[PDB]
Structure 1
Amino acid sequence: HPNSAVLADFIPVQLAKPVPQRITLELTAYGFARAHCLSNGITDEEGFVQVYKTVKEKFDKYAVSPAQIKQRQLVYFPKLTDIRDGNFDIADPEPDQAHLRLFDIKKDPRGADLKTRHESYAKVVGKGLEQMFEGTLEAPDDLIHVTCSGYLAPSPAERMVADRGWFETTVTHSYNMGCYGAFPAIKMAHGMLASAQWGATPPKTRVDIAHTELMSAHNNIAESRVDNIISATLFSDGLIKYSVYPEDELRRQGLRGLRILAMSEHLLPDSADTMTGVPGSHQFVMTLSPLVPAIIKRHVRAFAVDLLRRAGMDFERDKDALSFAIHPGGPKIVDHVQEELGLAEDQVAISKSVFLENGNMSSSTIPHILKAYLEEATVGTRIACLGFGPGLTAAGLVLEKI
């Protein structure tokens, strides 16, 4: 096919061994309780014990459970060494890796300030990027950097590109587009191949897209609000990259891929305050209203109907033969979308699995799901991809494995 772009070669990197969810819940409850006491000047022991009991009860009530997420990669969760009489014993790290310690449960419960967290994000994402691109043999024409969890100029992506001596590669930042960030990056990539075909640049044969989300860098243990307990137990870290080729180049290379058939994205009414993020003195501060599932449920089916129509497909006739890659924004989101679209389990199985084994890795989640489809599905399989994030924004893509 001429005028066709194709996703391929998804490469994730794990930077830290995932932590079993029940351990994350025990230590996070403990930290929240310590922080609450520091923030409120509670220094007596019985007082701690009372607060700690209340805190555990709230986690038991609201936290994402180990039945919902089995484990999470949390680069900035304490090392199992060293987690140590009714408390936990968190060893100071060796000055040699102080940059992994951003929380403080002893002195200042606000923990590291935003500059310090950004310096750490650059060092951690820098190493993650070198690993993701270690098997890259030739520079891309473009490299797109997706993140909503650390904003530096120049970025760790620009520094990697310069480190590889790739002085003919355009670097574009695709930033602050939250959980759905893969969708604008693939649209920009499809746009770069199409701009080249129009002649505004010389020809191009590959765009790489690198996501580096360190949501654990934004831990906030000083705020006990329910939505913060939920976020602290829901989100996880994820680093993954993939390429977008013009289909003739994909073929010349003998590669299998997911051909882009259509894209869509826009805002949903009466929703802007329901999912927010603002940089503060210490971290990117997030809010996440419990109204969000209902608003997603309200608009998903119409959005999917239109998305299929843009692909030359018809929802009524074609949706039974489709897979649906659905971003698992919260524990029930895939189920809500599944119910509203009338989907069978086998249509949404990979999305549920990625969530269960990894938690919500922000924009890196849909790429992990697409990675699984590309590695498991038969050629000919068509996939409708749906994601939702701040705006609220609905984003969609229709793909066909080739």
Structure 2
Amino acid sequence: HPNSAVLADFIPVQLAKPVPQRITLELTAYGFARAHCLSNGITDEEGFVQVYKTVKEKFDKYAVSPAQIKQRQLVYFPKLNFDIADPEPDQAHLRLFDIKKDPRGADLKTRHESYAKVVGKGLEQMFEGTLEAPDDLIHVTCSGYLAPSPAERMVADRGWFETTVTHSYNMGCYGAFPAIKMAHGMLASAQWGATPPKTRVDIAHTELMSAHNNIAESRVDNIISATLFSDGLIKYSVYPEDELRRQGLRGLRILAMSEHLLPDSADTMTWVPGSHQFVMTLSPLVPAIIKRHVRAFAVDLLRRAGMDFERDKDALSFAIHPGGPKIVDHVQEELGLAEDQVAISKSVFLENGNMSSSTIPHILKAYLEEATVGTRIACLGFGPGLTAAGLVLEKI
């Protein structure tokens, strides 16, 4: 196919062994209780006891449970009353919370320097099988912003002095979509002649959601986000389809893409850097707003691909970003989807939690590695805005 871009070769890197959810919940609950006691001058044991019981009750009620998420990769959760060891200065940098003295923990500068170090290493592992520089490298993240970025430093470390680096930043849980949109555009811009020809764009996701741990705030939506979000680093490539074929690779051919905002929703999800970490609010209104608009969005997306929702939806897999425990279910229900059309997305959430932008790429990795050639996949995700983003893919 001329004028075609193809996703391929998806490579996750695990930086830390995933922690069983019931343990994340016990310790996070204990940390929120100590922080709270530090924050309100409660100093006596029986004081901590009553606060701890209340925090635990709150966790039982509102925390994402082990039945919903089995384990999460959390680089900044301590390595396996609790007592926490100090770590080797060998790595004070993994320790960004504080339950003895200042409950706000590390400040943002410290967290940013930590991010650069951890992602730096992650990126060197993500790209160690890469033999030739890409024409472009896109860095996607919503969890740490530095200039130059860890991506820029790695490209230089590799001596990749003809590679364009583009930051695709602050586009949250759906950040794969705009990154794939750029990549498609960089291949199309090359075919238009504005740059010499290009044969590969590499996109690298690095989300350290656990770097933004906030145990000083006890509002429900913070309990929920502390127990919901997880870390994920994953890279994949975008090839012009002729280059994909020449290299004998399997891939996901891009058919169509779409993205725009949803009305009366801007305040329902926010994410803002403050003095110590990026701070989140999340309204319980969000799944209903997604439910309300997803169908019309999906019908339009399939039309963009020359498809018809009523006639073609049954043969499609739907890769859906699992933003909360019930998001896939809601979309499943609104779109009238069978279990086997949404099974991979539920399972990635169940095994990993919400790794923010890195989630959808892990979903697409499983489709690329499991589906028959010819399979079509409609991808949907949501993030702040609120934004709806979508992609139509075909396995080739």
Cα distance in structure 2, aligned partners of 1:104 and 1:93: 13
Question: Residue 332 of structure 1 aligns with which residue?
Answer: 326
SS at match of 2:173: helix
Return the alpha-carbon distance in structure 1 between the equivalents of residues 127 and 88 of structure 2: 29
Q: Counterpart of 2:145 in 1: which secondary structure?
A: coil
Instruction: Quote the Cα distance in structure 2 between the aligned partners of 1:279 and 1:136.
Output: 33
Question: Residue in 2 aligned with 1:73?
Answer: 73
Aligned to 1:84: none
Query: For each residue in 1:121-146, what CA deviation from the matched residue of structure 2 results, as whole angstroms up to 9, or x when unmatched?
Result: 00000000000000000000000000
Encode CA deviations 1:2-51: one digit per residue, 9 max, x unaligned: 00000000000000000000000000000000000000010000000000
Q: Distance in 2 between matches of 1:269 and 1:393?
A: 9
How many angstroms apart in 1 are the aligned matches of 2:173 and 2:363? 13
| TM-aligned CA deviation for residue 95 of structure 1 | 1.2
Q: Deviations over 1:164-198 (max 9, x none)?
A: 00000000000000000000000000000000000
Provide the rounded CA distance (Å) in 2 between the counterparts of 1:79 and 1:372: 28
CA displacement, residues 319-371 of structure 1 (integer Å, 9 cap, x when unaligned) = 00000000000000000000000000000000000000000000000000000
The number of equivalent residue pairs is 396
- Return the alpha-carbon distance in structure 2 between the equivalents of residues 173 and 95 of structure 1: 31
SS at match of 2:267: helix
Hey, what does 2:299 align to over in structure 1? 305
RMSD: 0.2
Cα deviation 1:275-315 (Å, max 9, x = unaligned) = 00111000000011100000000000000000000000000
Alignment of structure 1 residues 164-183 onto 2, 5 Å: 164-183=158-177
Cα offset, 1:55, TM superposition: 0.1
Q: Distance in 2 between matches of 1:114 and 1:386?
A: 32
In structure 2, what is the Cα distance between the partners aligned to 1:223 and 1:104?
Answer: 13
CA distance in 1, matches of 2:184, 2:117: 30
Question: How many angstroms apart in 1 are the aligned matches of 2:366 and 2:272?
Answer: 33
In the alignment, what sits opposite 1:9? Answer: 9
Instruction: Name the counterpart of 1:260.
Output: 254
* Counterpart-to-counterpart distance in 2, 1:362 and 1:332: 15
- Quote the Cα distance in structure 2 between the aligned partners of 1:290 and 1:154: 37
1:125 alignment partner, SS class: helix
The CA distance in 1 between the partners of 2:141 and 2:283, in whole Å, is 22
Distance 2:285 2:342 in 1: 23
Q: How much has 1:217 moved relative to structure 2?
A: 0.2
CA distance in 1, matches of 2:70, 2:288: 25
Q: Is the counterpart of residue 360 in structure 1 residue 345 in structure 2?
A: no
Name 2:380's counterpart in structure 1. Answer: 386
Distance 1:326 1:96 in 2: 40
Deviations 1:79-105 (A, max 9, x none): 11xxxxxx0010111111100000000
Query: Aligned partners of 1:155, 1:91: CA distance in 2, in Å?
Result: 31
Q: Report what 1:83 is aligned to.
A: none
**Cα distance per residue 1:189-233 (max 9 Å; x no partner):** 000000000000000000000000000000000000000000000
For 2:339 and 2:165, the matched residues in 1 are separated by 39
- For the pair 1:247 / 2:229, whether they are aligned, the reply is no
For 1:166 and 1:358, locate their aligned partners in 2 and report how far apart those are by CA, in whole Å. Answer: 33
SS at match of 2:319: strand
Shift of 1:154: 0.2
1:235 aligns with 2:226: no
Distance in 2 (alpha carbons) for counterparts of 1:89 and 1:270: 46
| In structure 1, distance between residues paired with 2:41 and 2:16 | 34
Q: Could you tell me how far apart the structure 2 residues matched to 1:273 and 1:125 are?
A: 30
| 2:382 aligned counterpart, secondary structure | strand
Is 1:193 the counterpart of 2:196 in the alignment?
no
2:128 alignment counterpart: 134
Q: Decide which of 78, 82, 87 is 1:88's aligned counterpart.
A: 82
1:136-163 alpha-carbon deviations (Å, 9 max, x no partner) = 0000000000000000000000000000
* Post-superposition CA distance 1:257-278 (Å, at most 9, x none): 0000000000000000000011
- State the Cα distance separating 1:253 from its structure 2 match: 0.1
Distance 2:291 2:369 in 1: 29
SS in 1 for 2:373: coil
Q: Give the distance between the partners of 2:29 and 2:124, measured in 1 at CA.
A: 34
Q: Say which SS state the counterpart of residue 74 (structure 1) adopts.
A: coil
3-state SS of paired residue (1:178): coil
1:289 and 1:203 map into 2 onto residues whose CA distance is 46
Give, in whole Å, the separation in 2 of the partners of 1:102 and 1:93.
Answer: 12
- Cα separation, 1, equivalents of 2:232 and 2:184: 23
Looking at structure 2, the residues matched to 15 and 206 of structure 1 have their Cα atoms a distance apart, in angstroms, of 26
Matches of 1:390 and 1:137, distance apart in 2: 36
| Partner SS state of residue 48, structure 2 | helix
Task: Give the CA deviation at 1:372.
Answer: 0.2
Q: Note the C-alpha offset of 1:118.
A: 0.2
SS class of match (1:180): coil
Q: Which residue of 1 aligns with 2:47?
A: 47
Partners of 2:88 and 2:219 in 1: CA distance: 32
SS where residue 10 of structure 2 aligns? strand
SS at match of 1:399: strand
The alignment's TM-score, normalised by the length of structure 2, stands at 1.00
Of 202, 208, 228, 2:202 maps to 208
